[PDB]
């Protein structure tokens, strides 16, 4: 049986079970349960039908706390009924969420506060109190330290109640986060499934466990999130003998997803959206993990680096040809020029290269190494310096091609070492034109927050949303996770701070652009255990975030906070299209002339998204009939699957329609 209190707390009564307070003249299970709920310390109690007594820890019956979320779960909204509370003679009202805590630095902790009301009163008498916590077990009141200088998290915990002064957030300025979406496996890696008329599914994957990894295992846990309908499922992919944790990821011309190395460091898996199945690729010429791969102008996939797994040495380039179905080793694609200097040595130094497919089968490497390089696949491979981005390495910085037409790359954050490393606020616009000629680098305004292990996406208007990351790179921690998202506007070279997300998204988190021009932010954590099947019970679960949250940017909102009217792409052929061809589509529901941009479908892991890029379009209109001449350079318009967004003149985007660019 399950009893639900008047605020929504849940207890599970199992008649016939046994396992601080012992109350007699209790007639039933329900009564003992009501005793359990009275006591902030009570997770489990025993009803004794024989002696008619209730023990707060057959002849007996057990009572167990069983909320929809477990104790210690991060929340974005009160799980239970909230109350308002105004401090007498104050004209200052607070929301109170029972059975929850605010974790993080305290401005003050005060002993001998015996009621929630006295805790609210203390908050009212403390300058700059926006969040306080009442400790039901110890009779103490904590005032939380000021945000966003400090990061404060909202956790489900019966010991406490939270007290807050609501902040008015204008979504027309700051966007809006939805609530946490619980997932079966930590989304350490994710990709949009190509589909017509628009994608509806995000696949995501961890390792052999939903919240743990080891080494080679031959299995990956996947989740499948239909963001159209909210349906979620999971599967264990074993048929490719591939633990896909810590891989390279690239989308092929035909929208198949090439997942390369990681825990099974020499294994390759190909996801086919048409079948929803994985097939074995050919083994890589070199075993690799934590490498980046990029799809090229000719549909081949280049990769370099990957010392995380396989041999613990620098890894030269190689290239996959999906038509020959072959890997070729490229020793002339030398790892040495692209190394960082890391306190953990070569294991780290060749990891997570900022790689972009460009003109004539070239590769631009934008970082994270101080120096930028051109790589190529001709002969045995090529390498040359292109520019100096910065005076330090920015390992796991964010980076995105926000304007492929103008060769524009934005990068921000990262840390000089992979871990135990203060993150930078530095940001840069890199401009590329002719491959194997100098790049240009312009330092732009610093980020408002230092961020290691952040994520970034380009939006239809060319702005870049940076989500999560932490002030100091500390693998597998929540520590000083930034919750405030930042929007960088390349037109003004300005940052704006957005609404805060609920959960820190640091190491092993992702972000990715959804077809409604919202951003999924999720994941974080994972536990290392020595062997496949070992117990995770000794793992710090507070750093695991088997969930995500979706950000609506400012462009989705009118000045009054209502949802702005979106253009509708009412008709577009599902036929593939070549570079230089004319895309035509019908647009309804726009006042004045829409703009159009293509955004390549994303794939993401370890602060690496080598599949996304924005290709802005010029359109001409005859009535409701739009036409755009696609760039004729496959270095700009990479093959594969794209979102087509039509935006109002004020910058509100349509739901995307899928466009397939072919060779
Ligand atoms: C992958 O293929 C290569 C070439 O046959 C082989 O020698 C290697 O052992 C294979 N490795 C794995 C890890 O399957
Ligand atoms: Na370093």
- Among all ligands shown, which has an atom nearest to the Cα of 421? 2
Q: For residue 202, what are the β-bridge partners?
A: 192, 225
In a domain, 350, yes or no: yes
Domain shared by 551 and 606, yes or no? no
In whole angstroms, what is the distance from residue 200 CA to residue 319 CA?
A: 31
Query: What is the CB neighbour count within 10 angstroms for residue 640?
Result: 23
Could you tell me if the CB of 266 is within 6 A of ligand 1?
A: yes
- Among all ligands shown, which has an atom nearest to the Cα of 415? 2
Ligand 1: which of 215, 241, 264, 266 to mutate, judged by most atoms within 8 Å of the beta carbon? 266
- Note down the domain range covering 181: 176-556
In a domain, 465, yes or no: yes
3-state secondary structure of 224: strand
In a domain, 204, yes or no: yes
Q: Is the peptide bond before 197 cis (omega within 30 degrees of 0)?
A: yes
Domain shared by 480 and 367, yes or no? yes
Residue 257: partners with Cβ closer than 8 Å, 6 or more residues away: 191, 249, 250, 251, 270, 271, 273, 603
* C-alpha distance from residue 15 to each of 18, 26, 29, 66 (Å): 9, 15, 8, 16
In whole angstroms, what is the distance from residue 609 CA to residue 646 CA?
A: 23
Closest CA to 552 of 294, 178, 282, 263: 178
Could you tell me if the CB of 627 is within 6 A of ligand 1?
A: no
Q: How much helix, strand and coil, in percent to the nearest 5, is found in the chain?
A: 5, 40, 50
Give the HSE-up count for residue 123: Cα atoms under 13 Å, Cβ half-sphere. 33
Write b or e for each residue in 433-462: b if 16 or more Cβ atoms lie within 10 A of its Cβ, otherwise e: eebbeebebeebeebebbbbbbbbbbbbbb
In the chain, after which residues is the C-to-N distance over 2.5 Å, breaking the chain?
Answer: 19, 57
Residue nearest to atom 3 of ligand 1 (CA): 283
3-state secondary structure of 97: strand
**Which tokens is 209 given?**
């466990």
Place of tokens 């060769």: 407
- Ligand 1 center–CA 222 separation, angstroms: 25
Residue 242: CATH number of its domain? 2.130.10.80
Place of tokens 């994520």: 455
Closest CA to 588 of 556, 629, 621, 554: 621
**Which tokens is 631 given?**
């760039």
Residue nearest to atom 10 of ligand 1 (CA): 283
In whole angstroms, what is the distance from residue 543 CA to residue 206 CA?
A: 14
Residues in the annotated binding site: 290, 507-508, 606
Domain shared by 549 and 585, yes or no? no
Residue nearest to atom 11 of ligand 1 (CA): 266
Closest CA to 352 of 294, 433, 406: 294
- Ligand 2 center–CA 271 separation, angstroms: 35
Give the HSE-up count for residue 552: Cα atoms under 13 Å, Cβ half-sphere. 20
Using a 10 angstrom Cβ sphere, with 0-12 exposed, 13-18 middle and 19 or more buried, the burial of residue 535 is exposed
Backbone phi and psi for residue 337, each to the nearest 5 degrees, phi listed first: -60, -25
Write b or e for each residue in 567-579: b if 16 or more Cβ atoms lie within 10 A of its Cβ, otherwise e: bbbeebeeeebeb
Residues in the annotated binding site for Cu(2+): 290, 507-508, 606
Could you tell me if the CB of 170 is within 6 A of ligand 1?
A: no
Closest CA to 423 of 474, 370, 457, 372: 474
- Among all ligands shown, which has an atom nearest to the Cα of 345? 2
Using a 10 angstrom Cβ sphere, with 0-12 exposed, 13-18 middle and 19 or more buried, the burial of residue 320 is buried
In whole angstroms, what is the distance from residue 592 CA to residue 423 CA?
A: 44
Domain shared by 379 and 462, yes or no? yes
In a domain, 268, yes or no: yes
Residue nearest to atom 8 of ligand 1 (CA): 283
Contact 229, 220 (CB under 8 A): no
In whole angstroms, what is the distance from residue 34 CA to residue 278 CA?
A: 51
In whole angstroms, what is the distance from residue 92 CA to residue 368 CA?
A: 49
Which pairing describes strands 547-552 and 176-177: parallel, antiparallel, or unpaired? antiparallel
In whole angstroms, what is the distance from residue 483 CA to residue 147 CA?
A: 10
In whole angstroms, what is the distance from residue 104 CA to residue 106 CA?
A: 6
In whole angstroms, what is the distance from residue 634 CA to residue 435 CA?
A: 13
Could you tell me if the CB of 329 is within 6 A of ligand 1?
A: no
Q: Which DSSP state fits 543?
A: G
Atom index in ligand 1 nearest the CA of residue 287 equals 13
3-state SS string over 25-37? CCCCHHHHHHHHH
Is the four-CA dihedral 526, 77, 453, 318 of positive or negative sign? positive
Residue nearest to atom 5 of ligand 1 (CA): 283
Domain shared by 293 and 269, yes or no? yes
* C-alpha distance from residue 454 to each of 412, 413, 414, 484 (Å): 9, 8, 8, 11
In whole angstroms, what is the distance from residue 220 CA to residue 188 CA?
A: 11
Atom index in ligand 1 nearest the CA of residue 266 equals 13
Question: Across 370-508, where does the E strand assignment appear?
Answer: 371-376, 382-388, 398-403, 408-412, 421-422, 427-431, 440-444, 452-458, 464-470, 472-473, 484-489, 494-500
Residue 655: CATH number of its domain? 2.60.40.10
In whole angstroms, what is the distance from residue 654 CA to residue 517 CA?
A: 8
- Ligand 2 center–CA 569 separation, angstroms: 48
Q: What Å resolution does this PDB entry report? A: 1.9
- Among all ligands shown, which has an atom nearest to the Cα of 261? 1
Q: For residue 64, what are the β-bridge partners?
A: 12, 44
Q: Residues 491, 496, 498, 500: what is their CA dihedral angle, to the nearest 10 degrees?
A: 140
Q: Angle at the Cα of 232 (from 228 to 235), degrees rounded to 5?
A: 135
Contact 572, 644 (CB under 8 A): yes
DSSP code string of 263-276: SSTT-EEEEETTTT
Place of tokens 């599949």: 611
Could you tell me if the CB of 39 is within 6 A of ligand 1?
A: no
Which pairing describes strands 577-578 and 657-662: parallel, antiparallel, or unpaired? parallel
In a domain, 339, yes or no: yes
- Overall number of domains in the chain: 2
**Which tokens is 568 given?**
């509708």
Using a 10 angstrom Cβ sphere, with 0-12 exposed, 13-18 middle and 19 or more buried, the burial of residue 537 is exposed
Ligand 1: which of 240, 262, 267, 283 to mutate, judged by most atoms within 8 Å of the beta carbon? 283
**Which tokens is 438 given?**
């100098």
DSSP code string of 579-607: TT-EEEEEEES-SS--EEEEEEPPEEETT
3-state secondary structure of 173: helix
C-beta pairs of 527-534 under 8 Å, 24+ apart in sequence: 527/209, 527/211, 527/212, 527/213, 527/476, 528/212, 528/213, 528/214, 528/476, 529/209, 529/212, 529/213, 529/214, 530/214, 531/214, 532/208, 532/214, 532/217, 532/219, 534/212, 534/214
Place of tokens 């949009």: 192
- Among all ligands shown, which has an atom nearest to the Cα of 218? 1
Reading phi first (left if > 0) and then psi (alpha if -120 to 50, else beta), residue 578 is in beta
Domain shared by 536 and 637, yes or no? no
In whole angstroms, what is the distance from residue 145 CA to residue 10 CA?
A: 32
Domain shared by 552 and 572, yes or no? no
In whole angstroms, what is the distance from residue 363 CA to residue 366 CA?
A: 10
Radius of gyration of the chain (CA): 27
- Ligand 1 center–CA 310 separation, angstroms: 12
Q: Which DSSP state fits 556?
A: G
In a domain, 222, yes or no: yes
Q: For residue 65, what are the β-bridge partners?
A: 11
Last residue of a domain, one of 556, 584, 602: 556
**Which tokens is 543 given?**
């750093």
- Which entry of 47, 320, 507, 642 is annotated as an active-site residue? 507
Domain shared by 429 and 450, yes or no? yes
In a domain, 152, yes or no: no
- Ligand 2 center–CA 37 separation, angstroms: 52
In whole angstroms, what is the distance from residue 516 CA to residue 494 CA?
A: 25
Atom index in ligand 1 nearest the CA of residue 265 equals 13
3-state secondary structure of 110: strand
3-state secondary structure of 209: coil
Domain shared by 413 and 537, yes or no? yes
Reading phi first (left if > 0) and then psi (alpha if -120 to 50, else beta), residue 353 is in beta
Place of tokens 């959960």: 503
Size of the chain, expressed as the number of residues it contains: 663
3-state secondary structure of 205: strand
Which pairing describes strands 189-192 and 603-605: parallel, antiparallel, or unpaired? antiparallel
In whole angstroms, what is the distance from residue 25 CA to residue 48 CA?
A: 10
- Ligand 1 center–CA 523 separation, angstroms: 32
3-state secondary structure of 118: helix
In whole angstroms, what is the distance from residue 331 CA to residue 351 CA?
A: 17
Closest CA to 141 of 97, 94, 108: 108
Contact 145, 153 (CB under 8 A): no
Q: Which DSSP state fits 401?
A: E
In a domain, 160, yes or no: no
Contact 499, 147 (CB under 8 A): no
In whole angstroms, what is the distance from residue 191 CA to residue 278 CA?
A: 14
Closest CA to 260 of 221, 286, 233: 286
Question: Which experimental approach was used here?
Answer: X-ray
In whole angstroms, what is the distance from residue 614 CA to residue 582 CA?
A: 18
Domain shared by 604 and 510, yes or no? no
Could you tell me if the CB of 283 is within 6 A of ligand 1?
A: yes
Q: Which DSSP state fits 557?
A: B
Residue nearest to atom 7 of ligand 1 (CA): 283
* C-alpha distance from residue 517 to each of 17, 185, 366, 601 (Å): 52, 24, 26, 12
In whole angstroms, what is the distance from residue 452 CA to residue 156 CA?
A: 27
Closest CA to 383 of 364, 370, 401: 364
Last residue of a domain, one of 514, 534, 556: 556
Q: Which DSSP state fits 530?
A: S
Last residue of a domain, one of 525, 556, 587: 556
3-state secondary structure of 124: helix
Domain shared by 544 and 573, yes or no? no
Contact 213, 205 (CB under 8 A): no
- Ligand 2 center–CA 389 separation, angstroms: 15
* C-alpha distance from residue 7 to each of 10, 122, 186, 639 (Å): 9, 25, 30, 53
In whole angstroms, what is the distance from residue 640 CA to residue 621 CA?
A: 26
- Ligand 1 center–CA 283 separation, angstroms: 6
Could you tell me if the CB of 272 is within 6 A of ligand 1?
A: no
Domain shared by 223 and 332, yes or no? yes
Is there a catalytic annotation at residue 507?
Answer: yes
Reading phi first (left if > 0) and then psi (alpha if -120 to 50, else beta), residue 406 is in alpha
- Ligand 1 center–CA 609 separation, angstroms: 27
Contact 565, 527 (CB under 8 A): no
Q: Which DSSP state fits 447?
A: P
Question: Across 152-195, where does the E strand assignment appear?
Answer: 153-164, 176-177, 181-182, 189-192
Atom index in ligand 1 nearest the CA of residue 216 equals 13
In whole angstroms, what is the distance from residue 101 CA to residue 93 CA?
A: 19
């Amino acid at each position: 049986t399950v009893w639900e209190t008047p605020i929504g707390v849940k207890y599970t009564l199992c008649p016939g079970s046994d396992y601080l307070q012992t109350v007699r003249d209790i007639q039933s299970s329900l009564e003992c349960a009501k005793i359990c709920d009275s006591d902030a310390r009570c997770n489990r109690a025993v009803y004794d039908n024989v002696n008619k007594a209730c023990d707060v820890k057959d002849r007996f019956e057990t009572i167990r706390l069983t909320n929809d979320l477990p104790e210690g779960a991060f929340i974005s909204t009160c799980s239970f009924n909230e109350t308002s509370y105004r401090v007498p003679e104050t004209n200052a009202e607070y929301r109170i969420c029972p059975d929850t805590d605010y974790t993080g630095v305290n401005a003050k902790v005060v002993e001998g506060v015996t009621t929630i009301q006295a805790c609210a009163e203390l908050c009212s008498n403390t300058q700059d109190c926006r969040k306080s916590v009442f400790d039901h077990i110890n009779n103490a009141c904590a005032i939380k330290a000021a945000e966003p200088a400090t990061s404060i998290f909202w956790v489900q915990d019966k010991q406490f109640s939270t007290i807050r002064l609501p902040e008015n957030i204008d979504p027309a300025v700051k966007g809006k986060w939805g609530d946490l979406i619980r997932l079966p496996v930590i989304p350490v890696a994710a990709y949009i499934v190509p589909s017509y008329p628009e994608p509806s599914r995000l696949l995501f994957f961890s390792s052999w466990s939903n919240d743990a990894f080891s080494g080679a295992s031959g299995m990956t846990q996947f989740g499948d999130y239909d963001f159209a309908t909210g349906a979620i499922s999971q599967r264990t992919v074993t048929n490719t003998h591939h633990d896909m944790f810590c891989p390279g990821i690239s989308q092929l011309e035909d929208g198949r997803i090439l997942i390369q190395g990681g825990s099974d460091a020499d294994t390759v898996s190909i996801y086919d959206p048409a079948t929803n199945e994985f097939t074995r690729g050919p083994n890589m010429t070199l075993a690799r993990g934590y490498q980046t791969s990029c799809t090229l102008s000719n549909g081949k996939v280049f990769t370099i680096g990957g010392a995380y797994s396989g041999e613990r040495v620098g890894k030269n380039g190689e290239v996959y040809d999906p038509v020959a179905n072959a890997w070729t080793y490229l020793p002339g694609a030398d790892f040495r020029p692209m190394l960082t200097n890391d306190h953990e040595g070569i294991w780290r130094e060749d990891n997570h290269a900022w790689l972009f497919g460009w003109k004539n089968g070239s590769i631009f490497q934008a970082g994270p190494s101080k120096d930028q390089h051109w790589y190529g696949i001709q002969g045995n491979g090529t390498v040359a310096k292109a520019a100096t981005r910065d005076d330090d390495d920015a390992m796991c910085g964010v980076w995105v091609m926000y304007d492929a037409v103008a060769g524009k790359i934005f990068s921000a954050g990262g840390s000089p070492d992979y871990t135990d490393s203060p993150a930078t606020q530095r940001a840069h616009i890199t401009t590329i034109g002719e491959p194997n000629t100098p790049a240009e680098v312009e330092r732009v305004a610093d980020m408002g927050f230092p961020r290691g292990f952040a994520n970034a996406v380009v939006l239809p208007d060319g702005q870049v949303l940076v989500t999560g990351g932490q002030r100091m790179s500390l693998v597998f921690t929540n520590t000083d996770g930034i919750l405030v998202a930042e929007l960088f506007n390349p037109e003004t070279r300005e940052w704006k701070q957005m609404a805060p997300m609920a959960v820190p998204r640091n190491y092993h988190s992702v972000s990715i652009l959804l077809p409604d021009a919202t951003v999924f932010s999720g994941g974080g954590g994972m536990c290392w255990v020595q062997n496949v099947g070992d117990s995770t019970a000794g793992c710090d679960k507070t750093v695991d975030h088997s969930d995500g949250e979706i950000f609506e940017p400012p462009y989705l909102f009118n000045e009054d906070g209502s949802r702005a009217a979106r253009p509708v792409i009412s008709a577009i052929s599902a036929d593939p299209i070549k570079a230089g061809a004319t895309l035509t589509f019908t647009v309804e529901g726009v006042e004045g002339q829409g703009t159009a941009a293509l955004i390549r479908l994303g794939s993401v892991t370890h602060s690496v998204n080598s599949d996304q890029r924005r290709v802005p379009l010029n359109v001409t209109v005859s009535g409701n009939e739009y036409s755009a001449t696609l760039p004729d350079d496959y270095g700009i318009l990479l093959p594969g699957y794209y979102y087509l967004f039509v935006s109002t003149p004020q910058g509100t985007p349509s739901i995307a329609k899928t466009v397939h660019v072919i060779l």
